């Protein structure tokens, strides 16, 4: 029941609230739970937005070494699991 | 106030798993509500690989790699300033 915000005002003001708390809950997890969390952000305006734990560098170069197969989510699966 | 000691190790797992899908689950709302593409890449305290992506991950990786510097970046040493102001 979510859907798309029109209002370019009301686009901007949600993206940044919403950016800061992804950021937040990031900072957070990496913290308490000893993570490497990189994220990656475009916005509707093609603007580019990231945040890493440690640097960016750091884990997008872990990334494309991992050997061991990958745990892997896109919308589909995140609506999916939010149904039930 | 050693700030990777302060979770109960018993339930560790419990607490990335939840914590993670919250993650994901915000990232899928951004992306929904303010048209993003979003992709997320963690690693947990035994070096498991986890992902998201709102498209699919080479896509938001390749444009990534297309863009030549980010508007914002941070790291943790960051957001910990941001968070005190």
């Given at each position: 029941?979510?859907?798309?915000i ?16 992804l950021?937040?809950?990031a900072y957070?997890?990496?913290v308490?739970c000893?993570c490497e969390?990189?994220?990656?952000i475009?916005n509707?305006?093609?603007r580019?937005f990231?945040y890493a734990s440690?640097?960016?560098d750091?884990?997008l ?8 197969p990958h745990?892997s989510?896109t919308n ?5 699991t939010?149904?039930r």
């Amino acid at each position: 029941q979510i859907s798309r915000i029109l209002d370019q005002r009301n686009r901007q003001v949600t993206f940044t609230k919403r950016k800061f708390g992804l950021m937040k809950k990031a900072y957070e997890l990496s913290v308490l739970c000893d993570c490497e969390i990189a994220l990656i952000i475009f916005n509707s305006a093609n603007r580019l937005f990231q945040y890493a734990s440690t640097d960016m560098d750091r884990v997008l170069l872990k990334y494309t070494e991992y050997s061991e197969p990958h745990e892997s989510r896109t919308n589909t699966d995140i609506l999916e699991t939010l149904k039930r």
